[PDB]
Subunit: 242 residues, 3 copies
Amino acid sequence: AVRENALLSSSLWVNVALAGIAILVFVYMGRTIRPGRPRLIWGATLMIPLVSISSYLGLLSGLTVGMIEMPAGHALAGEMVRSQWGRYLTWALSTPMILLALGLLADVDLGSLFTVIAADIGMCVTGLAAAMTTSALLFRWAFYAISCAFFVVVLSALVTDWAASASSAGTAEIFDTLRVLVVVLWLGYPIVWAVGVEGLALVQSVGATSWAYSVLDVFAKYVFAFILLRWVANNERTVAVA
Amino acid sequence: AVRENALLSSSLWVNVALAGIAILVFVYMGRTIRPGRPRLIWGATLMIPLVSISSYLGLLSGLTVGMIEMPAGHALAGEMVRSQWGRYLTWALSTPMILLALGLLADVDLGSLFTVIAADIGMCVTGLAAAMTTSALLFRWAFYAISCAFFVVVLSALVTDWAASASSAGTAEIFDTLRVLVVVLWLGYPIVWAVGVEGLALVQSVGATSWAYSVLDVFAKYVFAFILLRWVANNERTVAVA
Amino acid sequence: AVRENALLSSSLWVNVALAGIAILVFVYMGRTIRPGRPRLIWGATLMIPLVSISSYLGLLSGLTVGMIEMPAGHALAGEMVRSQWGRYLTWALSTPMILLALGLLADVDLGSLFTVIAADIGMCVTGLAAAMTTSALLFRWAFYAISCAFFVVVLSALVTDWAASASSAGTAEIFDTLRVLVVVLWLGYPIVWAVGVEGLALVQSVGATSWAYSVLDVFAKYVFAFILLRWVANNERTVAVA
Ligand SMILES: CCCCCCCCO[C@@H]1O[C@H](CO)[C@@H](O)[C@H](O)[C@H]1O
Ligand SMILES: CCCCCCCCO[C@@H]1O[C@H](CO)[C@@H](O)[C@H](O)[C@H]1O
Ligand SMILES: CCCCCCCCO[C@@H]1O[C@H](CO)[C@@H](O)[C@H](O)[C@H]1O
Ligand SMILES: CCCCCCCCCCCCCCCC(=O)O
Ligand SMILES: CCCCCCCCCCCCCCCC(=O)O
Ligand SMILES: CCCCCCCCCCCCCCCC(=O)O
Ligand SMILES: [Cl-]
Ligand SMILES: [Cl-]
Ligand SMILES: [Cl-]
Ligand SMILES: [Cl-]
Ligand SMILES: [Cl-]
Ligand SMILES: [Cl-]
């Protein structure tokens, strides 16, 4: 929109640049990747920053940002707030690719991978619903709670059958490392929503709320992808033999 | 919306309660489920009532309900009618989870499961299109007819290759029982649409139309899930050995 | 809309008729298809014209067509143009079914098929974003470029691991033929977008732009499906034995 907020603007352009750099680094890193399992995981990995760039373009252009009036009870009840709904929306595409990458690395069951992606999509769409609901504060937090439930379904797989699959696939070392990053970093998103302007609004700055999500993306997406890709490039032997 | 219709309101809250009770019953029933195939189907099953609750929250909050003006020729031509479009929309997520549960139980081909889910999604989205179309009555019913065609694609699998897979997976008894429930109960949805306010409007009450869908959901989702889960919990032997 | 343009109208009705004829021809051609791989690919194939008909109904009814104001710099800057956004939207469902059909025929890896469909969906949604963006010309073309990148991900599979899979599946002859059709015909869509009213507008006619896409659909969907189905019906032996 007619945005003149440098704090807000910078939080978006910064990741267009970092995501672009990521794509180049990854394409390069895959220069000598053997066909099969390795090459595939490499493909799933390149998609992460590509989707991310698309997301930040939507926000920067104003296409996926809108004004939402907060309901009675909210700290900003009666006011219109800038909602970056494009973030929720695009996650529904980026979280599934992150999970496919991990699923392949761990060589998990097809039925398990499918159930997890379904739960992840549900988590993202109910989160969008929480942000878009304007009739009553009760419904906004009800969606947030249901979204949390789907999040638990996704996490349960990472702590159970996916870890067991990685152990039999010979990738337990890298999986355990990535699992910690996923759980810790993913817990950051619902905390930002809750503390930010759309939840409790303990922090009323939209620019600050935006920078919090942008920093998380840097680690949950770009650094995560790099660590995964770097391991695969140096362990094509154990990955391909699966 | 500014709804004061108790008939309409009650048809929604009733299922928020029943769906909530279902989730608890299911989590409990899965207390002693062995890892592998069983545990997975248990996961796919818990997702059904979770998605359902999300759907009823959307309707209750007014987020996924809207006013649609009926075209010339319609029994209510020129009037604005309350459309619970959130139902169509959410089915696109709930019907696929019901099918995954059945697909696993029957241990069907990956290519078959994928084709069926695609047809199911097409059925749900063209049904939404039928409800949202306002230019001419002809187009509303054209979408309804195409939606019926996708429904036939889904059903053809249940009467052919999915039954054959269940027979070789040792789950033909439970599959045949669930198949009857699915076909009979699913035929109920297009009949309600056709007889209700959005189709022919033989019944002009939006509250009554809503209660019809709510009753179907109780059986097609909650009772269906219970029957499936109860069998799996008592036959983990034949399910896991797949 | 209040369309009186015969050029535009005819480009839509023509394909409702051709798509309808296609469905009948295909159902018929599958009369004596043996169960298993063959029958499945037959199913994936019938879905193509079904989805296509749904798409043209959306456009004809006006449900998925809208007016978009072009930004400064555009050849039609400041004017409102008719956007057939329903095409982009529905492709997100039709391109994936075309790819499933090919994936089965070639008996490709599950992880590869999944990565490709994800990239295809990204291609379609960023293309929609390009069409819907109105704030600045820069963002419209930025989305177009990102969409092109996803297109490359999809194509890379057709020239690498999918061809290798078809060779080991004994379907390299038919795959190589279909691959040429897919690549050549798919390159046509971004060219029409670029040359048409939404891109550079070298051709400002919306009716002409619409006919270009309609002709491509005839070959990329109907003729493509026929060629694939006809081969399968005459080679059920090599297909099923997979
Ligand atoms: C699953 C977690 C659900 C938490 C529900 C929190 C409901 C409280 O909601 C909070 O109440 C405060 C005081 O009125 C307001 O200032 C905040 O803006 C509002 O979000
Ligand atoms: C696939 C089944 C298609 C059925 C198409 C039915 C078209 C008739 O449509 C019906 O006509 C009645 C009389 O004008 C009206 O009162 C109804 O509201 C209208 O839905
Ligand atoms: C990936 C390919 C990106 C191409 C970016 C093209 C940007 C130019 O954009 C073009 O500029 C012309 C002159 O101002 C206008 O007349 C056209 O309408 C406009 O689309
Ligand atoms: C690998 C399977 C993926 C299936 C994913 C289904 C859900 C896709 C949701 C896609 C939303 C895309 C919106 C992008 C918006 C933007 O960045 O401009
Ligand atoms: C297991 C694969 C699933 C892929 C599913 C693709 C289509 C998803 C459609 C999701 C619509 C979700 C809307 C929920 C709305 C609500 O309840 O508030
Ligand atoms: C086989 C997996 C498919 C998963 C597909 C996910 C994305 C589906 C997008 C569907 C858009 C449908 C809109 C149809 C509109 C119309 O024709 O009226
Ligand atoms: Cl993203
Ligand atoms: Cl913003
Ligand atoms: Cl539902
Ligand atoms: Cl309602
Ligand atoms: Cl289409
Ligand atoms: Cl048009």
